[PDB]
Amino acid sequence: GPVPSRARVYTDVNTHRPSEYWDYESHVVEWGNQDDYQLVRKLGRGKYSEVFEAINITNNEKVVVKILKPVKKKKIKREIKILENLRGGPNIITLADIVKDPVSRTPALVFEHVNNTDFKQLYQTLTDYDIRFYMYEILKALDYCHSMGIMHRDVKPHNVMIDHEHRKLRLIDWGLAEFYHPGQEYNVRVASRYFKGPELLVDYQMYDYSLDMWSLGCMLASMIFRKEPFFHGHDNYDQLVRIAKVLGTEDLYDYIDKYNIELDPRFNDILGRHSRKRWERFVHSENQHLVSPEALDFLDKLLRYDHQSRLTAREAMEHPYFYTVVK
C-alpha cells in the first residue's frame, strides 16, 4: 500500500482537542432572525451557493448573504463549525450570523461585508511590492487555519477578497475546508482543477495542510509571470502532464517511488518524458519587473511534488521574499 504520511507541523492539534471542536456532525446551529437582513444586489453564483450583497436593517450595516443549495447538505455543518472555530483569526472572513427560510428551510450564512474584489482583478495591475504584501497576508490566514487543525482545500484567486484602498484581505469560501486527523485518507476530489496538488492527481489520499501550499504556489506563479492559470490542464489527468512538463517527470517518478503510489495506467502513455524547466524560462519583458531571485527561490520551495518538502505557511513567512514587507 502507499507509504503513510503525517503533516510536518500542527500534526496533533485535533488529537489533543475535545470532540466538540472537530465533531461538526454534533454541532447544534444557533439560528438568527432572517427578518433582520434584506437583499441589496446579486454578487455571484457557484455550484452550491448564491452570494448577495445585503443590509442588516437593525443597524443599517452592509453584509454578504450566502444562500446554500440542497445539492450538498450535511456539509453545511462542517462549513459553519470551521467558520466559528476560525472566527477572529487574521484575514479570516467573519461569519456574523446564520439564518434559515421558515418555508423552504434553505439556510444562509451572513458574513461581514468586504469589497467584492477578487485577487484576479488586481494582479493585472499589482507591482512587485503589493504581490509580496498580499501573499504575506494570505500566509497569515493559512498559518492560522492550519494551526487550528484546518485545511482550506480551495486556495485560488476567487477565494481571496481584497479591499485595495484599505489594503485589507480575507480568505473566504470555507465550503471545501476540513479537519486534519493524522492518518486520514481523504477524498481527492477537492480544490479547483488548476490549483490541485500532485497528491490529488495521483490519488494519494493521506494529504495534509501542505495541499494549500501547492495551491498558493500556483497563484504566485500566475501573478509573477502573468500566466493565468499557470498549469492549464484539460482534465485531472492532463493537469499532471502540465505539471510534469515544468517540474519534470524524474522528480514525479521519485515522488511516486517514495510514497509507493499506484499510478493509474492512463498515465503510462500520457505523462511521457520531460526534463525540468528552470523558473527563469518563464521570465519575459512584460513580467520581469515582478520577478526577483527571491520570488523564484520562494516559488521553487512551494511547487514541489513531495508535499512534505514544501514550505509550511510559517516557514514561507520567514523567506527572504518577505523582507521588503515592512511590519
Binding site: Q34, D35, Y37, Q38, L39, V40, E50, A54, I55, I57, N60, V65, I67, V99, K100, D101, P102, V103, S104, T106, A108
Partner: peptide, 13 residues
C-alpha cells in the same frame, strides 16, 4: 412572494 429565499428585497437608504 416578492421575497427571495425568505429575504425581503431592500430598496434605498
Amino acid at each position: 412572494g416578492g421575497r427571495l429565499y425568505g429575504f425581503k428585497i431592500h430598496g434605498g437608504g
